[PDB]
Symmetry: D2
Subunit: 264 residues, 4 copies
Amino acid sequence: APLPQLRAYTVDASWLQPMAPLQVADHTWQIGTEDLTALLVQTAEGAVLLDGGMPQMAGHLLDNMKLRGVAPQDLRLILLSHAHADHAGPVAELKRRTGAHVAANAETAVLLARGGSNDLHFGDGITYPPASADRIIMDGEVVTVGGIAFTAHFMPGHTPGSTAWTWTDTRDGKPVRIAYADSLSAPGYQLKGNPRYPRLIEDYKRSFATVRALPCDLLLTPHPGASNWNYAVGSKASAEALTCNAYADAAEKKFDAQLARETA
Amino acid sequence: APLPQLRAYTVDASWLQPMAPLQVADHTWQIGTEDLTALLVQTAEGAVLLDGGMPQMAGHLLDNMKLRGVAPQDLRLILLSHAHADHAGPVAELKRRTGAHVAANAETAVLLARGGSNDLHFGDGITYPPASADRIIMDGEVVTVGGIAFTAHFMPGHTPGSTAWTWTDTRDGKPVRIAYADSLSAPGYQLKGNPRYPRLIEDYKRSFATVRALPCDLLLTPHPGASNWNYAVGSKASAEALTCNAYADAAEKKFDAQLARETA
Amino acid sequence: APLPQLRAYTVDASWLQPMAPLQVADHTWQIGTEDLTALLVQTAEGAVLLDGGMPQMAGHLLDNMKLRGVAPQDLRLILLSHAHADHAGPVAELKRRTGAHVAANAETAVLLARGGSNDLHFGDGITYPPASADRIIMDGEVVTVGGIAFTAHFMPGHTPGSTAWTWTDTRDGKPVRIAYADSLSAPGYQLKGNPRYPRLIEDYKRSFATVRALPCDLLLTPHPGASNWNYAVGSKASAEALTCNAYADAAEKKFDAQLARETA
Amino acid sequence: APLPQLRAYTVDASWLQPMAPLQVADHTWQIGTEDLTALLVQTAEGAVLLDGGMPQMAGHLLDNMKLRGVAPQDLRLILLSHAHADHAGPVAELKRRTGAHVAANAETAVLLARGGSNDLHFGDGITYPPASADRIIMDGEVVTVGGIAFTAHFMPGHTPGSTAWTWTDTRDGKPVRIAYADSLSAPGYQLKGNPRYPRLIEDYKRSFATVRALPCDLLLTPHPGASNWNYAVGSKASAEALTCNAYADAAEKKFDAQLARETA
Ligand SMILES: [Zn+2]
Ligand SMILES: [Zn+2]
Ligand SMILES: [Zn+2]
Ligand SMILES: [Zn+2]
Ligand SMILES: [Zn+2]
Ligand SMILES: [Zn+2]
Ligand SMILES: [Zn+2]
Ligand SMILES: [Zn+2]
């Protein structure tokens, strides 16, 4: 009776289905897969990438960047929602090939440093190549790249270092407030009485309130299904998209019902 | 046509076959699996562990330590051959559970820090939970734990931070010189003209000469088959074991023949 | 006109005045200097150190530990208030000499990793030898060492990773609730409108409320003068000591008055 | 009798005397101080910086880069001789302000990670703000930036991670082989029988032989006085400059004489 073999992190086939760069705003593009958000912001002084998806999406991200006229050396900064394998995967490879920097808070940095290992809920289940953060950011700190200001918003819950990013773009001159809120889900988490996360419920409840008060005209999420986005249809992607109020309120109803069954 | 899924590091069933602590010397024990060496040295001032095997062997290593009367808090130091997944796997977990420290050279430390990712030959193929080295050691530096002195010997080749450890034990009072030499194999390595390892042949040839001149009465290797060890038979394990001269000479003949076919 | 020379972090002569181990409880001792708190907790399964003082206090801390019958290998864990040079100094040296581990939250870990450099308020003014945290702890997480449970309490303000530690000891059988609250001061900090710490006032106000509700029968602080402690008199040290309510209320009055003059 | 205060790393006034960018080749410039070499290489695809000097030279380096038409975002890579305070000082600050990457071997990376603390010879005497290396390089590995190839040459001795960099430039079309060899000095080092560096003499002797065989038409050193450079005179700076043979032979004569007096 030998010890069990290692098990790879296998996901849905749609999480790895490549797609052409979809336009969200004048300067905002979606260059990830169909069911994994990877946003690219093009400025006059460089490019910014928000999340990267699965670790094997590094070649796909660089393919779409060159379709947008972005060279590897043009990627100046990498921002992350939370440091999980399905969002912060190719960060280690994109730093080696793009000369880019990574900005994240302390909790996302310590999780990114150990490649998602020793997860508070998953343990060593979703390990990815480790990367290092080059700039530590705080709650409400503004990050400016090429005239575009990215404001951070701490929304801890899914991970201790979950961060929502808000920035203002344009749609043919008309300004648009874009808010990239992180996942408000707890799949299989022990909510009440967790010794690894003693204040998990408090942070989740406080995150529901933070997501509602986000300056937002167009909401996106790391998983497009969480915000009723459909990257596949293309032009009608943001048709049935939800609001910040609708997103936080729907995520809170699932949270309380899950917390209610946990006590049972 | 989606992107390919992640692939787990699967090994032979014998690499994960647990075994009872096998006695090598008065203070030296083998607490790993049948085809993966994990040595335990028991002293009056603590315990020393040399290598740990596959990442899923952490529970097995702690099981055999308690069979030897070693508590988790008694493990003072962890030494490594080279920082690969099949030898330096459970190091991250054993540091969390044993309060132990890790001593390695700079090359093994930088490889252990990124969990084997960006391997010079394997890339991101054999990623394991990342660990940190607490003490940087140099070539020939002596590490003393409880009156037992561990002398390091740099033998670069398999990895840039490959290290052979030599220490003197006893066999009912009679002293025994034990040498734990690292792997001298290059499975699938590009030997000549490697841009990631330009001086690979020089380090390999210089390592063959370093292994021969090791003070050794009983030679062990991270893979027992490389030194003609058979942990399964038990008492007759060290019967057909090879010498340092035989180990280095046999490994050099395979190296030159492999290098000869590479040019073809 | 050459560039200015480097300037060392010079403190008061009383911060570096050694003293004999002062007894606080049955298992709690003060082994630092006269005006720098360094607490030692002796258990049946090891010793715990809370803070270490100035970087040059490493030899003094080890001197008092041996006076308490504590060997270097007996120090199992190191806990910190905040990762500044006058409190987390000798941590890098004590890890090399004691085989101990360091537990801290993510913010204290990222600050300890860069040796206090790039401080949000001091910059590169108070750089100390960098150390690494071996275990990341969360708000309210319990850390047990030898039957004594240390509960963490996040009180951000002085540093983003400021932590108050609470544990229950005895005084000849009678239990005593000890609370080691961090500094609630902001010397020279820009409170309102700080781009490096946008939510500084909110964290300070929320920390005043967290310090009041701490389970405490005897309050200590990293600076004994902040809690009206006098390590010099010895037996009458805790005579005029303040309560958690008195400490938080007095620190809040200085904070609001400082904030009021900042707007002027 | 209090403990001694911290002591800052004070150097000569000439090590911090700023100077205008001095031209060494068509693409190579000296932008450091009078007695501290800091080389800037300008390419069509970015800029490369070799060494940075004292930690307080970060503002001076950025001043000269803008005089050369180099923006902070144009600095793509930072290369180092060895990770000491007088050469790898402002690396931590230049990474925050230039978006640049650092490439170094494993030994220079582990020394740069702890800010020069726990030096094998100086201990915690010359601590500087810690930085992280983004790319690990090996002996003889080529680093290409904008058509200019930088070849590394390991010359261990002064530090375990001492590296000489060689690249070919032009002087009005005519090619020039530039070799930037590291310091071959051991000021106050214990050469024979050092437990922290057991193989120090072997590495020094092997480094003397490596410096002689360097492809070099114009030799520079981190200290211009070591290679008979005089950055002050300007045009006649490289007049009395030494060869690689002269540099290694003169450094070896001082080494053997120092080793001879050590035994006395
Ligand atoms: Zn997730
Ligand atoms: Zn996810
Ligand atoms: Zn291997
Ligand atoms: Zn192997
Ligand atoms: Zn302080
Ligand atoms: Zn202080
Ligand atoms: Zn030096
Ligand atoms: Zn120097």
